[PDB]
Amino acid sequence: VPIVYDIYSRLLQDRIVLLGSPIDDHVANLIVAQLLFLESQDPDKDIYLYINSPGGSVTAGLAIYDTMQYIKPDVVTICMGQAASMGAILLAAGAPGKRYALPHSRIMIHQPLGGIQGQATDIIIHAEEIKRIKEMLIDILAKHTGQPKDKIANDIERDYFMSPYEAKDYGLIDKVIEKR
């Protein structure tokens, strides 16, 4: 990790945040901390969240999602490499009109996965909870894309891969950017 301030700390001074890993509680804490820090520095200036993530923990993802919606600054989202699963939800959740993808990035949406062991009663309790979480993710995708809930629900049953041009047509991003 090179020095100038480490390279990431230096980019943080330009209000750039990198989400460049699978999303777990550790990564969510780091992303939330940076968004809260940048809001306290200047609540009016745009934040630039670069996304290269295959996704990860739904609850960790929703910690970042609710923080992005709650803070005053607009969060600009930029997809490089890929925004898949929870990564795709965070890309789509950027400020309206300020959601970007680079031209050879890919976006993928799909339903959540789970694991549950134990008594039938407990399996049914956890099946109910994953159902509630799935409906929530459908609701979030519908709100940010403008797609009807029944189209989102049908499309995420299996892995749904999109080029940046397909993601733009879907409403997951506003623009494909090639050159500054």
Subset of 96-135 contacting its own copies (CB under 8 A): 102-106, 110-134
Per rule CB under 6 A, count of chain residues that contact ligand VSZ: 13
Structure token digits, residue 56: 């990860």
Collapsing DSSP states into helix, strand and coil, what is residue 160?
Answer: strand
CB of 45 to ligand VSZ, least distance (A): 29
Active site residue 126: no
CB of 146 to its own copies, least distance (A): 19
CB of 133 to ligand VSZ, least distance (A): 3
**One of 85, 105, 144, 163 is an active-site residue; which one?**
85
Report the 10 Å Cβ neighbour count for 58. Answer: 21
Output b/e per residue, 66-96; b: 16+ Cβ within 10 A: ebbeebebbbbbbbebbbbbbbbbbbbbbee
Given 28, 31, 51, 55, the residue binding ligand VSZ (CB under 6 A) = 55
CB of 174 to ligand VSZ, least distance (A): 22
* Contact track, ligand VSZ, 8-47, x by CB under 6 A: ----------------------------------------
**One of 110, 126, 144, 163 is an active-site residue; which one?**
110
Decide: residue 19, CB within 10 A, 0-12 exposed, 13-18 middle, 19+ buried: buried
Per rule CB under 8 A, count of chain residues that contact its own copies: 90
Amino acid at position 1, single letter: V
Decide: residue 118, CB within 10 A, 0-12 exposed, 13-18 middle, 19+ buried: exposed
Given 42, 45, 46, 69, the residue binding its own copies (CB under 8 A) = 69
Decide: residue 98, CB within 10 A, 0-12 exposed, 13-18 middle, 19+ buried: middle
* Chain residues that interact with ligand VSZ, rule: CB under 6 A: 55-58, 85-86, 112-115, 120, 130, 133
